[PDB]
Amino acid sequence: MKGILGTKIGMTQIWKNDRAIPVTVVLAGPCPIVQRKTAQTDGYEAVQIGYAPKAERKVNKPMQGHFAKAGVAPTRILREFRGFAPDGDSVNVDIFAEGEKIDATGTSKGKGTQGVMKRWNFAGGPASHGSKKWHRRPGSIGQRKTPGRVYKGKRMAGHMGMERVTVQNLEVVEIRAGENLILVKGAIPGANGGLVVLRSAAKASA
Amino acid sequence: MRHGKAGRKLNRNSSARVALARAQATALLREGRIQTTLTKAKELRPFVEQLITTAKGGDLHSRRLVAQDIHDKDVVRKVMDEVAPKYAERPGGYTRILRVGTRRGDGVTMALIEL
Amino acid sequence: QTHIKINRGELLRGIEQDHTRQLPDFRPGDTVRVDTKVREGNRTRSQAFEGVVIAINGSGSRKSFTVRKISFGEGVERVFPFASPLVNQVTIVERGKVRRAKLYYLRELRGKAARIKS
Amino acid sequence: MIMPQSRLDVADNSGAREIMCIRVLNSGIGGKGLTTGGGGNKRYAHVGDIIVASVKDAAPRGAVKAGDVVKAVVVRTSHAIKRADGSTIRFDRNAAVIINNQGEPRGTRVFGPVARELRDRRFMKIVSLAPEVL
Amino acid sequence: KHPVPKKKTSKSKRDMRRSHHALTAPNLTECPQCHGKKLSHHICPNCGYYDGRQVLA
RNA sequence: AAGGAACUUUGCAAUCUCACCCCGUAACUUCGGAAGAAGGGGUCCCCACGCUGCGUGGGGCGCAGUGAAUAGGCCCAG
RNA sequence: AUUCCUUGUCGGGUAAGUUCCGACCUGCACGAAAGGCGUAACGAUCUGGGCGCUGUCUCAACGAGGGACUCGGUGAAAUU
RNA sequence: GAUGUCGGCUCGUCGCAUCCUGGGGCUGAAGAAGGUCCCAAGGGUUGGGCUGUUCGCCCAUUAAAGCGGCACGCGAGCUGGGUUCAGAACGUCGUGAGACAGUUCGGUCUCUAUCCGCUACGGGCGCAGGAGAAUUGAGGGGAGUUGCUCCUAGUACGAGAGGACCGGAGUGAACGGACCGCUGGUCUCCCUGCUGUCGUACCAACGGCACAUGCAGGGUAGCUAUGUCCGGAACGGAUAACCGCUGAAAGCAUCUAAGCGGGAAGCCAGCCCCAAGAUGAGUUCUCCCACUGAAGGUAAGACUCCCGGAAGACCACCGGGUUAAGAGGCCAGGCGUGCACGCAUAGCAAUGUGUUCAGCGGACUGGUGCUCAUCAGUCGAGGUCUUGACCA
Numbered sequence A: 001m002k003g004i005l006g007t008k009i010g011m012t013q014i015w016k017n018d019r020a021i022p023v024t025v026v027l028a029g030p031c032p033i034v035q036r037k038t039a040q041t042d043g044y045e046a047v048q049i050g051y052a053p054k055a056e057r058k059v060n061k062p063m064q065g066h067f068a069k070a071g072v073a074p075t076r077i078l079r080e081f082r083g084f085a086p087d088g089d090s091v092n093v094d095i096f097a098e099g100e101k102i103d104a105t106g107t108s109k110g111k112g113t114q115g116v117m118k119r120w121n122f123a124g125g126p127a128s129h130g131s132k133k134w135h136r137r138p139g140s141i142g143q144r145k146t147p148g149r150v151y152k153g154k155r156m157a158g159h160m161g162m163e164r165v166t167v168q169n170l171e172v173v174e175i176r177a178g179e180n181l182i183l184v185k186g187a188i189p190g191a192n193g194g195l196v197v198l199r200s201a202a203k204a205s206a
Numbered sequence B: 001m002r003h004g005k006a007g008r009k010l011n012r013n014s015s016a017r018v019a020l021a022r023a024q025a026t027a028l029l030r031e032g033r034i035q036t037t038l039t040k041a042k043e044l045r046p047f048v049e050q051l052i053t054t055a056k057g058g059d060l061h062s063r064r065l066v067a068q069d070i071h072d073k074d075v076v077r078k079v080m081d082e083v084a085p086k087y088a089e090r091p092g093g094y095t096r097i098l099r100v101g102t103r104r105g106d107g108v109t110m111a112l113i114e115l
Numbered sequence C: 001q002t003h004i005k006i007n008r009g010e011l012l013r014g015i016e017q018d019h020t021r022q023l024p025d026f027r028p029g030d031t032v033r034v035d036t037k038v039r040e041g042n043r044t045r046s047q048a049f050e051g052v053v054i055a056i057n058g059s060g061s062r063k064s065f066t067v068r069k070i071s072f073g074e075g076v077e078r079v080f081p082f083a084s085p086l087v088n089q090v091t092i093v094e095r096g097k098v099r100r101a102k103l104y105y106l107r108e109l110r111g112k113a114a115r116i117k118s
Numbered sequence D: 001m002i003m004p005q006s007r008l009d010v011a012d013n014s015g016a017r018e019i020m021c022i023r024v025l026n027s028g029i030g031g032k033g034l035t036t037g038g039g040g041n042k043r044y045a046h047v048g049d050i051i052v053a054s055v056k057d058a059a060p061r062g063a064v065k066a067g068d069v070v071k072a073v074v075v076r077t078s079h080a081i082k083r084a085d086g087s088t089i090r091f092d093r094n095a096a097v098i099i100n101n102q103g104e105p106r107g108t109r110v111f112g113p114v115a116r117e118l119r120d121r122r123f124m125k126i127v128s129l130a131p132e133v134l
Numbered sequence E: 001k002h003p004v005p006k007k008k009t010s011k012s013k014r015d016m017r018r019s020h021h022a023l024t025a026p027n028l029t030e031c032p033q034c035h036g037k038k039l040s041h042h043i044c045p046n047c048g049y050y051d052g053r054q055v056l057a
Numbered sequence F: 001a002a003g004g005a006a007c008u009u010u011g012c013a014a015u016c017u018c019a020c021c022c023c024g025u026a027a028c029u030u031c032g033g034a035a036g037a038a039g040g041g042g043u044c045c046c047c048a049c050g051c052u053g054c055g056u057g058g059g060g061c062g063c064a065g066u067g068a069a070u071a072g073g074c075c076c077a078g
Numbered sequence G: 001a002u003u004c005c006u007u008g009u010c011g012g013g014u015a016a017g018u019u020c021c022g023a024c025c026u027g028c029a030c031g032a033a034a035g036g037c038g039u040a041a042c043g044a045u046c047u048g049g050g051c052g053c054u055g056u057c058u059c060a061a062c063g064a065g066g067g068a069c070u071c072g073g074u075g076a077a078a079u080u
Numbered sequence H: 001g002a003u004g005u006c007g008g009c010u011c012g013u014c015g016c017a018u019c020c021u022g023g024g025g026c027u028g029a030a031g032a033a034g035g036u037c038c039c040a041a042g043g044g045u046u047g048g049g050c051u052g053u054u055c056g057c058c059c060a061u062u063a064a065a066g067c068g069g070c071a072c073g074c075g076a077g078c079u080g081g082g083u084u085c086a087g088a089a090c091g092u093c094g095u096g097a098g099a100c101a102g103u104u105c106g107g108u109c110u111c112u113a114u115c116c117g118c119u120a121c122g123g124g125c126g127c128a129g130g131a132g133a134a135u136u137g138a139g140g141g142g143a144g145u146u147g148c149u150c151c152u153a154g155u156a157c158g159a160g161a162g163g164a165c166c167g168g169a170g171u172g173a174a175c176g177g178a179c180c181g182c183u184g185g186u187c188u189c190c191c192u193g194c195u196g197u198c199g200u201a202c203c204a205a206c207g208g209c210a211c212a213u214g215c216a217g218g219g220u221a222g223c224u225a226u227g228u229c230c231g232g233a234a235c236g237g238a239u240a241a242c243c244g245c246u247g248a249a250a251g252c253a254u255c256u257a258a259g260c261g262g263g264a265a266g267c268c269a270g271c272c273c274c275a276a277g278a279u280g281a282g283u284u285c286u287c288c289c290a291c292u293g294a295a296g297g298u299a300a301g302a303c304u305c306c307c308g309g310a311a312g313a314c315c316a317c318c319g320g321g322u323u324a325a326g327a328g329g330c331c332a333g334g335c336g337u338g339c340a341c342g343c344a345u346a347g348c349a350a351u352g353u354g355u356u357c358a359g360c361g362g363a364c365u366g367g368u369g370c371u372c373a374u375c376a377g378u379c380g381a382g383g384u385c386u387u388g389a390c391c392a
C-alpha cells in the first residue's frame, strides 16, 4: 500500500551502535498527487504520482492539461500505487518510519547480450584437454528424434539485465526527513541516478 | 560492456592510438586546420586541446611537457611562443569541427578540425 | 535516469561527515592503535596493535589503514576504518622514510633486518 | 577458505605438524560435544570451522602420528576475515589445531595467535591455550 | 559438420526477405546562401558556406 | 583473491626453472660416467687499493641489479 | 608387453590403490641365439610415485589485440 | 546410393515401482530410535582413491547420498580413455600366408545453418479520427530443498538408563536475484621505478623499440567473486491416503447409501517477472479540431539530423539541442601516484637534502556559455453504417 518514488544517490558506510552497515541512499523527493483513481470511476483503486520536475517548454500540450487538471507543476515521471489513498501530497517523511521493512523496486543495470555462463550460470567446457568450445558455449540443446525439437523456455544467450527487479524486506536505517533523504540497508537494484519505488513489504513477515 | 570507459580503440593497439593522436596533433598546430575522418577528429579534439593548455604555462616545465608529446622542435616553439599566448583569454574553446561531405573510396563522412 | 538536477557527491558527503573521524597524520610510520574488544562478555576489554602502516585507502567514512605486526612468529595484518567505534585512538611510534604509498613488498621480507627506515 | 587438499599448519604440541584437508564439516560445539551435520555440501572452511584431515607430516615422539585421520579446527586463514565494526584480519599463513569429538584440543598448548571468532564459536578452551586472540 | 541448405528458396520467399533493403532517401535541404543542394549539419558543398565560407570550393 | 592437480584417460595444456661466476653434490658403475645430480650463494652504480678487465675493501640507490630480450624444472622406481 | 579364472593372496605407497613395486607360485598358455636371466650409460620410448609451480581445477573474473556487429567497394561454395 | 558405436563432459526434461523431506494406518508401536504398508513427484539427492569404464569396492560426510525413460537422451555440442584400419611385440593356433570378442605401445573426429524448433531484438499492418501519457490482468513464466541449536523440558513416558510430539525462537549450508559501500581481483598507457639501444646536435632532460603494455611497482571509474544485501514463506480455499459427526437398506452396528467437518512439501490462490496480435485487440486522464480541392496545405504531435548515455551487435530505449549546462574544453574539489623540472647546497663521486603533501593526471563530484549541438526538411486528423436510449 504505502509507497513513494525516488532517485538512487549512492551507497556508503555508516555505523549504528558500533556495527558497520552498508546503506544505499535514496532521494525520495516530494511526490504530487496528480490523478486519483477510484473503482467507482476507473474500475480499480490506485493513485497516480509524479517525480522529477520538468520545465514547461519541454511539456506536451496534452500532458500540460493532465497536470493542470490537478494543479501540479509538471513532472518528468508518473506512476501508480494500488491501494494507496493519501491526501495532500506524498513526502518521504510522513509515510516511512525508522526500521520498517520495505520493498525496494528498481530497474536492473543492464548488461547487453550475454552468454550462457553469465546469463544462466552454465558450467561451460574444459579449457584444456583439447576442446574447441574452450569455454563459454552451451553444450547439448536437445535429446534426439523422439523429443524432436528444443524445449520452450530453454536457456541460451540473450539480453541479460535491464529488467524490473524488486528486493524484498530491506530495512530503513535512517530518515533525514527535511532533506528528503532515506538510508536503506543493503543494495537496491539499478544504477546511480536511476528511478526507484519504495513501498511497504509485500510479505507480512511474522 | 563499458559503462564508463572513455576513449576509442581506433581499430588500433595501445602503441598506435597514441602515436596517431600525437602525429595528428602535430599537424593541426602546424597547419591551423586539417581534414580527416570525422571520428579521428572527435578523438583528436580534447588531446590537442589539453596539450595547448599545457603550453599556456609559459615556464620551462610546460615546454618540456609539450615536448614529450610533440617531437618537432619547430611546432613546439609555435605552440609555445605563438598560439598559446594568443589564447590566454580563452577558457578552453580552442578547437572546432565542421564536417564536410562523404568520400568515395570507402564512403566515409569526413570533417575539418580547426582553431 | 530520472534526471533530477542535484549534486550527488554533496548529498553523499552530507550523510557521511557524521561518520567520519580525523586521525593523526601518518604515512608508513609505526603505530599504537589502542582499541576496544567488548566481545569479552558484556564488559569492555582494551587491546593495542603496533606495526608498520602499509596502506591508506578511500575517503570520507570509507577511509581505512592497514597495519602489519608479527605476533608470536606469524605475520599478521589488520585493516581499521578511521571512524570505527572500536578504534579508540591511534598514535605514532616513529616516522619512517619510504618511497611508495603501499609497501606490499614488506610481506615477504618478514625478517628483523628488512625493516622500515627513519 | 580452506578446502580439501589444502595443507594447513598445526597450532599445537600434539605430535602432528602438517595436516592436509580431507573434508569440510559444518558442525560445532553443542552441549553434547560436537554436533553432527550442518548439511553435507559446504565447500570452504573459515576460522572456527571444524574440518577432517589426514595427518601428512608429524614429529617423531608425540601423541599424533602420520596418516591419522583427524578432526582439527582452523585458527588462521590467509583469507581475510571481517568484523561487525568493519575491521579485517589476515594472517600470513594457514594453520589449525587438532581436536577430539568434544572439541577439546589434543595438545597441551596452542602456538601463535588465534582468531577472536573462536570465542564466538564457543571453543572456550582453545582460546585458553592461545597466546593472543588477534 | 558442414551445414548446407536443404531445398532451394522460392522466388516468393526470397523476395520477401529483401522487404527491408530499401535505401533511405537523403533528407536534402536548400542552402540559404548558395543556390540549393545541401545535407543537414554539413557544409554546403557548392559554395562552401556553413555561415560564411569554410572550405575552399 | 584463498586453495594447489581436488581437473583428467594422462599435470594434456600452461606455469615454474633459465645465462655466466663461486661453493657443494647420491645410490649405482663397464671407473669414462651418472653430473648442469640434487642444493646454496653472487650479479647494479661510485670511490680508493692491487694485479695484464678482473679481484680486495669502503660507500650509494631501487620492490627488484643475466633490472628489458635470448638461455634447463628436478628427483625416486619399473 | 605371456595369467583365462583375476581387482589371485600377503605386504609397500594412499585417507581410500582394479594401476604400480615387492614377495608367493595353482606357469589356462615362460624358458635358453624365433636366445634365458642380469646390466652402467643412453631414450621427443612406455608405466607408477614424489618435490616444486601453476586458471588443469573449486570457478570463474577483469583486461588486450585479430574476427564476429555496422557502413561504403568487389562478391563465392557445398546443397536444392 | 551410410540411422557414427562404449564411456566421460555440457545441457536438461519426463515416469513413479519414493533415497530425503511432507501427511497417514498397523506394529511383536512405553519414550527415544525403528519395521512395514497407504497417500504424495514441490524441491533436494555431496566431495574424493582405483578402473576407459558403465556398474562395483573403498575414503570422508550427508536429510538423503532413489530407480528408470528420452535412438542403452545429447559427437553439424566437446572430447576420444574403451573399441573396430593400416605399424610393431608377446602368449596361443596354423607347415605357411595369416589368425581370436586375448593382452600390449602408437594411430587425421570434416571454418559458413536454408526450413522447423529455440534465445534475444526490430521493421509492417491491424486494434472505425490523429495524438501524449497512466493502466485492468485473460493468460503465461520463475520460485518451491533441508540441517543444527535453544525455549517449552530434563516436562509427558519410562524401574532405570535415557527422553519426546505439538507449539515458539535463533543460526547455517547449497541454490538463486540484485548490488559494488565494505574485503579483494583487474583495470594495454592514470602515476612512478628500471635495463640495452636508437634518436631529439652534445650535457641535463625526454620520446620510440624490446608484446599484439619491454619489465617491474601501485592503482581511480567501470566491470567482477571468493565480497555484501534480500529470498524460499504466513494466512486461505478445495483435496489424497486417512480421521470423524448425523445415519439407513437389517426395531443392532456401520465415516456412506442422500448429505456434512477435518486432513499433505502436492492442487488452486497469495510472492516475484512478462502480458490486450486477450484480431474477444480492454479501461482512464489530457490534447487538436471539423480545411481545401481517394488525395493535398496544415492542428495536436512526431520523425529526419546533430551532441551524448550507468541503453546497446544493428535496430530499439533515455537525455540535450541557444527560452541551452547535453557533451568536450576550462576552473575548483575528490581520488591516484609519491615529492617533478630548474636552481641551490653537501660530497672526489655514485647520490643525499631543500625549494616540494611537490609534479603529473582516464573514466569521479560540481560550476562555467570558451567548442559543437547551425540551418532547416519529411511526415501527421477530419472521423462507415445499423439498431436502442436520452435531449434536441
Ligand SMILES: CC[C@H]1OC(=O)/C=C/[C@H](C)[C@@H](O[C@@H]2O[C@H](C)C[C@H](N(C)C)[C@H]2O)[C@@H](C)C[C@@H](C)C(=O)/C=C/[C@H]2O[C@@H]2[C@@H]1CO[C@@H]1O[C@H](C)[C@@H](O)[C@@H](OC)[C@H]1OC
Pocket: H002, H004, H108, H110
Ligand atoms: C578432417 C577434415 C577432412 O575430413 C576427413 O578426413 C573425413 C571426414 C568424414 C567424417 C568421413 O565420413 C564418415 O565416414 C565414415 C566411414 C562413416 C561416417 N558416418 C556418417 C557413418 C561418415 O561421417 C569420410 C571417410 C568420408 C568423405 C566425406 C571423404 O572421404 C572426406 C575426405 C577428407 O577431405 C575431407 C576433409 C579435408 O581435410 C583433409 O585433411 C588433409 C589432411 C589435408 O591435407 C587436406 O588437403 C589435402 C584435406 O584432404 C582431403
Ligand SMILES: [Ca+2]
Pocket: none
Ligand atoms: Ca597468491
Ligand SMILES: [Ca+2]
Pocket: none
Ligand atoms: Ca558490405
Ligand SMILES: [Ca+2]
Pocket: none
Ligand atoms: Ca535463419
Ligand SMILES: [K+]
Pocket: none
Ligand atoms: K567506488
Ligand SMILES: [Mg+2]
Pocket: A110, A111, A112, B001, B003, H311
Ligand atoms: Mg549497458
Ligand SMILES: [Mg+2]
Pocket: A123, A124, A125, A126, A127, A135
Ligand atoms: Mg571453466
Ligand SMILES: [Mg+2]
Pocket: A147, A148
Ligand atoms: Mg513431433
Ligand SMILES: [Mg+2]
Pocket: B011
Ligand atoms: Mg576493421
Ligand SMILES: [Mg+2]
Pocket: B031
Ligand atoms: Mg596550410
Ligand SMILES: [Mg+2]
Pocket: B053
Ligand atoms: Mg591545468
Ligand SMILES: [Mg+2]
Pocket: none
Ligand atoms: Mg599524457
Ligand SMILES: [Mg+2]
Pocket: C006
Ligand atoms: Mg549533472
Ligand SMILES: [Mg+2]
Pocket: C097, C098, C099, C100
Ligand atoms: Mg620505499
Ligand SMILES: [Mg+2]
Pocket: E001, H075, H076
Ligand atoms: Mg558430427
Ligand SMILES: [Mg+2]
Pocket: none
Ligand atoms: Mg605447494
